[PDB]
Every structure is written in structure tokens, then in C-alpha cells.
Symmetry: C4
Subunit: 326 residues, 4 copies
């Protein structure tokens, strides 16, 4: 008999249900606990990607109430410098930085803690790997107060493994990324709505938040990820092509573009077979207007669902399952 664990749902499979409301979109509270000690003003994390987050983007997002994650596709010294630029800014801004879950990263982590990183991201393509769990147990034992986000997982067992290893927050997402080809290359993936709810259910009562990472295309996807139980979302494509993102603006035929590629793409990699594509994204302009539009969508959802806080959206809002016709 075919070993089918369950049916799994993606963003497009569901819709949120309107409910009794005393919530006006302008009155909605978007603050969220990224960890027990770290509270963000908006539930937005920028992707730890070489075409998405460096100090400039991390500064703009922190100013909006979110948090950026400096990618690991650079030298230890460059990364420590990027973190220092964000920490020494003005309005006491928070920053995160990504590290590989393999051997020979103890030095990179040391430099990042010295530079004043608020949250270390152990950036793995498979968080349920034993090597990853051991490295986070080792980072936790060395730095007992350091806020650590571990990922990625897409199951209840994977979420429990990261929480037991010492993670302050667990990142969910195996295969949902806009630039991901893991589903086609390996045949592995878990539809994000189910992946998030499974991870959140596993971590209930622990106070360990879940980050929904990947596949957010519209502000409606943010709302769905949060009502599935995520405390925050991580976005790549949504912030790619913004003025603040790294890389130069290109001109194809009148229209402005920026590069956007998976960290598992042939380009980002230069041994594993690629699990990401290399693409051009239309220039989005200033990050501030993107955040205002996306958070506005979330605000209107909160009004329609009668959830005045991120915690209410996470625990009260209901879904309906829809067909391909829906």
C-alpha cells in the first residue's frame, strides 16, 4: 500500500472566513514575538539570499518594524561588517545573519556574535539532518543567551527536533520558494499551509515561534501563513528588485530589472545538483511602499476576521477549503 501520511494544503487551497469584528484595519496591531525575547513591530523577515538581504535592505526593513537576515554568500569579515553597519545605525535596529550548518562555521558564528548579531540563522536546506541538530546544540551550549533560528523543516517531528536542539524560533519551508526546483529535482516537498500548521501544533505550549518561509506571493498569503499558526513570515521574491536589495539595476528593453536567484542555483553555488533557478525580477522601487501595501492587506484581513492582534489571527481565524474552480 502507498505510504501516504496525509493530504497537504498550499495557500491557494484555502480562504479565510470573515467573522464578527470590532476591528478597524487602521486599529490592528501588527506586533509579533519572533522569539521569547525579540518582539517585531511587523511580522516580516527578509530572506537570507545574495539577491535579497545585505546591510542596506536589513536597515530599511528594521525601520519598518521587521528584521533582515544577512546572507552567507560572502567572507566572514564582510558579513561581520554588514552586521556592524546595521547595529551602529540610529534608532537601535535589530539584525540577523545566516550561517551554514556544516563544519568550519564556528569562526563565522564567533565573528557575528562579536559584531553584535541579535539572532543567528542556521540556514540549512534540510533542518532535520543530524549534522544540523548537532551544530545548533553546540552553538546553544557555547552561547546560552544567543537567539537562534533553525530551519528549514516541514513536519511536526522536524519542528520538535529543532526546538529540542535549542532553537529560539523554528523556520518552516521545504519546497515552497518561488525560485525553488527541489520538488521537481528530488520529488520532496510539503505544501506550506499544512507544513506550518503541523510545526505549530508540535510546538504548542513551548513558546517557540514558527516562521513561514517561502511561497508568499501576495499579502493574502501572509494572512494565511499567520492564521495557519506562523508568528512571522520570511520573504524573498516580495523584496527582490527593491532599491535597497543588493546588485545593480538592469535595463532589458525600456523596463528596469534586478537579479533574483535561489541559493541552490548554478550561479549562487559557483557538489550538489541545482535546486534553484536564476531569474530577473521587475524593479519594485523603495521597500517602504512595498511594506505599506503588504501590511495594508494584512490590516484589512484583520478587520474582516475580527482579529485585532497577530496572536488573535494565529489562534482564532478559520479557513474554508476550496476547489481548483474556487
Amino acid at each position: 500500500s502507498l505510504r501516504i501520511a496525509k493530504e497537504a494544503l498550499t495557500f491557494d487551497d484555502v480562504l479565510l472566513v470573515p467573522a464578527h469584528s470590532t476591528v478597524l484595519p487602521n486599529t490592528a496591531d501588527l506586533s509579533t514575538q519572533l522569539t521569547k525575547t525579540i518582539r517585531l513591530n511587523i511580522p516580516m523577515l527578509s530572506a537570507a539570499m545574495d539577491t535579497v538581504t545585505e546591510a542596506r535592505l536589513a536597515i530599511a526593513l528594521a525601520q519598518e518594524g521587521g528584521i533582515g537576515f544577512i546572507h552567507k554568500n560572502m567572507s566572514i569579515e564582510r558579513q561581520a561588517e554588514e552586521v556592524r553597519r546595521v547595529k551602529k545605525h540610529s534608532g537601535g535596529l535589530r539584525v540577523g545573519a545566516a550561517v551554514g550548518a556544516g563544519a568550519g562555521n564556528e569562526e563565522r558564528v564567533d565573528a557575528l556574535v562579536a559584531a553584535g548579531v541579535d539572532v543567528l540563522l542556521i540556514d540549512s536546506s534540510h533542518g532535520h539532518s543530524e549534522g544540523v541538530l548537532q551544530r545548533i546544540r553546540e552553538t546553544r551550549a557555547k552561547y546560552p543567551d544567543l537567539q537562534i533560528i533553525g530551519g528549514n523543516v516541514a513536519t511536526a517531528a522536524g519542528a520538535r527536533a529543532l526546538a529540542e536542539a535549542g532553537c529560539s524560533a523554528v523556520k518552516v519551508g521545504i519546497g515552497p520558494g518561488s525560485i525553488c526546483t527541489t520538488r521537481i529535482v528530488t520529488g520532496v516537498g510539503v505544501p506550506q499551509i499544512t507544513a506550518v500548521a503541523d510545526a505549530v501544533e508540535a510546538l504548542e505550549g513551548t513558546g517557540i515561534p514558527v516562521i513561514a518561509d517561502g511561497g508568499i506571493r501576495f499579502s493574502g498569503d501572509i494572512a494565511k501563513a499567520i492564521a495557519a499558526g506562523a508568528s512571522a513570515v520570511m520573504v524573498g521574491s516580495m523584496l527582490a528588485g527593491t532599491e535597497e536589495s543588493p546588485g545593480e539595476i538592469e535595463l532589458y528593453q525600456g523596463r528596469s530589472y534586478k537579479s533574483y536567484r535561489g541559493m541552490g542555483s548554478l550561479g549562487a553555488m559557483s557538489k550538489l545538483v541545482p535546486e534553484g533557478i536564476e531569474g530577473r525580477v521587475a524593479y519594485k522601487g523603495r521597500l517602504k511602499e512595498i511594506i505599506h501595501q503588504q501590511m495594508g492587506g494584512l490590516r484589512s484581513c484583520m478587520g474582516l476576521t475580527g482579529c485585532g492582534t497577530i496572536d488573535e489571527l494565529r489562534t482564532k481565524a478559520e479557513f474554508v477549503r476550496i476547489s481548483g474552480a474556487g
Copy 2:
């Protein structure tokens, strides 16, 4: 566990079942109770939109046996004048007018009642909001005999809330509109067939009719909405581009067009993020031929289902659920 209330169906998910019939399409009775006191000759209401209903369209539809709803995107004096033009016509024509569910609308409602409005439409994007319920309770207490339609809702709880608040009829539709982007922007919506049946079930035995508002593309959709339990349907796109609708006819490249936009579009709005698009619809001609074609479709359905009246269609006709292949 993911909080999935139920699976929800849209027009395309179902088909009506042919049954024993003594009904000829030409013998079918299309009359319906919009409220306990108001009976329409056809189950058609025109959308309270600035690109759909003003006095001219409200006059043509009333003549066909339906009812128009003058939009709120104008001055109190202009709206009172539009209603007066319809009431003082010839064959004792009925009219409705839309009002916002916010504060500072008591004056607009006063002018509309004075002008002779037959039915006041409390036009909300979220009828289950406390503010809306309170304003309709206040309008009901001030005007105890005034026919009031309240909306929009898409749940059993929402329908009961509007009926208890004093509504003479309840309007259903959260996200089904042809020009709606609420599903993408907020992630909120309820597939219309389920939304209608849920609202009708909640109001059974109260004599409060349900209006199916939004997503009607074909005459088959009208039949489906009515068999789901709606007493009448409200149409926007179906009447957009008619000669009687407001705005001027445009010429793009040989072909004639009219503007059609959501009331939550950037244009109609000029603070909330837009929940509607701005578009061009092909010129449809005289409203009379559109009504004849659409009601003819409904008539043939009544013949195929053996339902001689709107009430029989609402309570006897059965559906089959179909797949994406169907």
C-alpha cells in the same frame, strides 16, 4: 491542527439536475419577494456601483421587473435627485439607494427617505462589523417601516447578525465579484454557492430573503444562486457597458467600450489598500435585450428542473458536484 471550518463550493463546482417537468419555459413565473412587502417581477438587482447604477439604469431595470441601487459615490443632493427621477416616472417604479455603514450618514439616509426610496441599502464591504450592525439597529429604530437591505456577509452567523439588527433582506458575497481582489489582498473569501446556502439555512423560517451578490457571469449562475436558496441576485459586470449605465462610451480600436471598476479600486476610492480593479467592458447595448437573454436562460432552467416559480427553484431543485474535468 489547521482550523478548516468546511469545504466551500463556487458556481463552477456544481450543476443543476434535470427532473420531471410540467413546466414550459414560457409558462415559468419569475416573480420573487425581495422583502416581505416588496415583490419583484424578475429576480434582478443592479449593483450599487459608480460604473453601473444611476437613475437611467434604475429606470430601465425597474421597467423589466427588477430594481436598481443608486451608488453612494456622489453628493447627498445628487443621490436624492436620482431617486426622485425614478419615483416620479410613469408605471409606479421602485428604487433603492446605497449608503455607507460608517458615521456621518444619518443625513444621507434622511434625504433618501424624503426623496421616496423604497429600500435603503447599507452598503458595507464587511456586514459582520459591529459598527454596521449598530448603524442598521439605529436606522431601524428611527424608520420602523423602511425596507433595509444589509450586507455583505458570507456565513450563517453573519446572516443572523444582520437579521437580528433589523434587515428586511440580507446580501451575501465576500470576495466573489468579477472585479474583486479581496481574496488576493486579504486572503479572505467564501465560495458563493456555499456562502448563499449557509445564509439561507440560518434565516430559514424568518421570512428574510437572501440576495446573492457577485460572481454571476452567465444566466446559469443566476439559476444556481437561486437553487442555493437566494430569492434574488445582484449583478455588476452583467449590466456594465449597457447603454443605460453611467459614463461615456469609449472607442479603443473600432470596438466600443465602457468603464467597469470595483468600488474598492484606486479610481473609485479617490485610507485602505485597493480591493478592486479598474477595467474596460465591451458595450452591451440596450439593457432590455440583456434581461431578455438572461431571463430566457433562467426560464429554460425552470423547464429542465420542473420548478414553475422562483420559490420552487429555491427549495426543490437539486445539484450534482463536478470535478475540474466536468
Copy 3:
């Protein structure tokens, strides 16, 4: 609660299961009982349409082992002449002719019986209509030995109604036609695989065969309709554009075409709203090669399923349900 009688399946929703076989495709017996007295060599009936069957096509199909149905879109005298041409041919060929189920058709039926019609087709768009049932009871009482096919129905109740009224065979199909718009216009229809199995189950033990009429696109659809329980299939589009079909061959831009339209199209009609489209079909050539190809497909199915006769295919062959991905 939404009145959903059941889920209903179409051809594309299912696949036939390969089984143990001693059947070679060349050894397969395609003969079938159209009625208790009439046996066809192939399970093919041509559609009673003005762009499909007249004496020439009825002659070619009868020669292949099937039966044609002369359409009613002509004078009583022309129709009687068409039937005479087929009956007085060479190898003792069988013919059918279509009549409307309304009043003022007694005369048309009289002329057709005189001309030597083997099977009268009471051609209704809604066979479950009381008027239709009464007219077939009247034809049965007048002509007790005349083979009568009544249709169309798409339910168990509809099949029983036609069988009780006196039908020698029942025709199934409400909305499946390639040129049908009833599903969009009226919202009524039943996916054909379910419609056929329901009608066959209702008629079990009566010896009244079921004809699957409409939506056959490929030879695989013929096999599916028969395994659903149909004794034969009726085809319109599959035979449209053949040399033998009525009308002239048109030249658009190098390529040859023939007209194909629904009997409920604006053209065929020239009062009801249209339920059919008017189109051009590519010229198919001689009917003989079409039949050889389509019956060859059926033969290979019989080999794969191990069903040596039409009766075995109807009662032994199994299906699997597939998804949109399948």
C-alpha cells in the same frame, strides 16, 4: 444545506483497468442490441442533426454496421423520402428518423412508419417533460410493435419514466454535447459517465438498452460509455465533416471544412434562448476510415480489458478514478 444529490463523473475523470485477457483485438465481437428486436454490428448511432445525418450518411453508417437518424429540420415529405432511399437500398439496411415531442407531430410519425422506419426517435431536449412522456405513450398505443427510442434523460427517475412510457431504448445526455451551451445558459447538466451508469442501473432487468449520447471525442470515450453500461453510443462531432454528411465543403485558407452546429443554435432554430453553438469542423473524408479507426480503438480496449463482446465490456470492465493531474 446545499441540496447536493451526489458527485458526478465525466469521461476524463476515469480510466479503464487492464485485466486478464484471452481476447485479441481482431477477435472482438462488436455486435450490440439497440433494442430487444434490433441488433447492430457496431455500437454506433449517428446524431439526428441537420449538419450530421441525412440519407447518404445513414446509408454509409448502416453499411458499417451502425444506424443513422434522419433529422427533423426538414418537411414531412422530405424526411419520408430520405427514409425510403435508405430502406430501398441493397443489403437490407436499417434506418431511424427524428420527431419533435410537441403537438402536431402525429402526421410526421404516420409518414415515417409508412416509409418503413425501423426505429422512431422522439428527439427531446428534456425527455423527463410530461408532454414527452404522454406523446410516447400515445405513439406506443397507436403502433404497438414500432421500435421507439426516447430521450434525452440523465437520471435514474428519467430512465424509468421513458421505459414506463413505452420506449424500446432510452437515450442519455443532458449537457455533454461538444456543441452544447445548456450548462452555461441554464446551469443544468449531468456528467455523462454518472448519467449513463444511473440510467443503466435504473433499467436493470428490463432489457431496455441505454444509448450514451453526446461528448464522445475519442474512441476511448466510446469504450468508457459502454463500460458505464451503454449498449451503444450516439455521435455528432465524430461524424460531422465526413464526405457523407449533409452540406457543402468550404475552403477557408487552403484547408477544407464543413458546418457543425447544435440543433439549439441560432441558425438551426431559425421561442427559446440558444443552447448550442455554430461552428466549422475540419473535413474528415470518407466515413469508412473514421469507423475503422474508432472501432479499432474499441477493439484494443476489449483486448486490454479481456471483454470479448459488447455485453462483457458493459458488465465486467472496471474503472479507476483519476485526478486533474492524471
Copy 4:
């Protein structure tokens, strides 16, 4: 009632679940038992097709750790020569050869055994046919030690029939081929994921491996077929257009192509109606790079699922069912 045996799933209907892993993709063991006596280094078999496998391709694939199957669309002497070329190469390479399951093939089989064939492929379009079963029982009685692969089947009953007839391995696949039209022509087919799991369940405890033949488009499909229980996969389109495949390279408009057609196509056939198409595939280059890419995908899956061997992937890895939206 419609005779629906069950719902059946294809590759696109499912995804593999990530699990706890101590497996690095580079450490994964790809070896598999094609039969009790034959062990391959990679789970890849090339299709016995005239546009896919001849001695050159069979040599390249064997060198990669797989096995080729020389097609039967040639003379007995040519086929015996092709097998001799592979057997007499260098690093003791294994080869297979295809034979028809009809009468007058005893001579072809005799020549192939003499030439040193390691595995005889009884290549039938319907393995559950009595003729096929009898011919393999006869080959088994004549050659008691000869490794025989019999196919194709897509049911538990079909797998048991081939195993009881003497097959050393059973090949699964009715209708999944990229170039197959059997589903459209005959209406017969079984979605491959279900077909494989059903055949594997039927053969549990017998030590008779199952080959998943047809529809493999991506390396993710290989992983899915193996986790469904297949010990190996057979590929046609994946190896078509490689330098090693038969036929000449064509130039259409700057781009290089090779022919790829079904063995049931009009061309390969030159009596049955065609069940295959004739097409052009883009030139893929050297087989070595294709294998490296595809096996790399499989390796990454093994890392993500924590399955270090083909046997672990076959018996431990779990799936989730996904929607059309997934």
C-alpha cells in the same frame, strides 16, 4: 452503479516527505537488485525502443551502472550482433534484449541466449494477456536459469500472473509513457504511482523486483517511483536524443534534434490502430552528463528523506497527497 475499483495517483499527485537524516547525498548508495541474481549500480534501465536503445546506448548506460534493452524492431541476426558487441566489451558489461510475446519468437530467443543475453525482456503491450503468460511459462521451462523480465501490467492480479508464470522481474506501466496515446485510443490506463504500489504489494515476500516503466520526466519522478516500491525505473524520453541513442541528429532551425516515437506509432509499426506518437526531441548530448544530473537528484532526495540505500527509499519514505494547486 459505476464499477470504480479505486482512486489512482500519478507522479504529480504526490510529494515525498523530508525526514530525520544522517544521509549525505554523496554517501547515498544507489545499488539495486534488478533480479535475485542481477545487481545494478544505478536503478536505471533504458527503454526497448528503436529511437532509444541499441548496442552503443546499452554500452554507455551499463558503464554508468545501469542496463540497456535492445529493441525488437530489427532482424534476429542484427539483435544477436548488438548483444555480442555489449557482452564482449571491456569491464564485463550486462545487457538485455526485447522479444515479442506472440508466436514465432522461439528462434529469436534462442539466438539471444546463444549471444550471451543476461536478461530476456518479454515486451508486451498487455502482460496480463494469456498468450504472454503461456510464452513466458514456455521460455522458463526451456531456460530455467535465464533472467526474464515480463511486462507490462498495472494491477496486483497482473503482477501475480507474471510472477507465477516465471518472471525474475515484473515491469509496470499501462498508459504512462510520454509518447503513449493508449489512454485516449482505448480509454485504458492506470496512474503510475498506484500501478507500482499495487504491483509491489502483490509481490511482497517473493523477492521478485518491480520496474516502473514510463512517464518519468524529472529525477523527482525516479525518487517517487522508487518510494512507491519499484526497485528500478525504465526510461525512454529521458535518454532519447542522447549522442549514444540510435538514428541521426537533425537540424530544424539552428537547434539539434533526434527522433523519438512510440513502438505503437504509425512509423514504428510499418494490424492495430496506433497507440503512440512520432516526435522530435532536443539533442541532449552525452548520456554520462544526463545520468550524473538525474542520479544527483535521486541522491539529494535520499539526503532529504534519510534513506541511505535504494531498499530504504522503497520501504521507509512517506508521501503527502497534494491538490492541483500544489
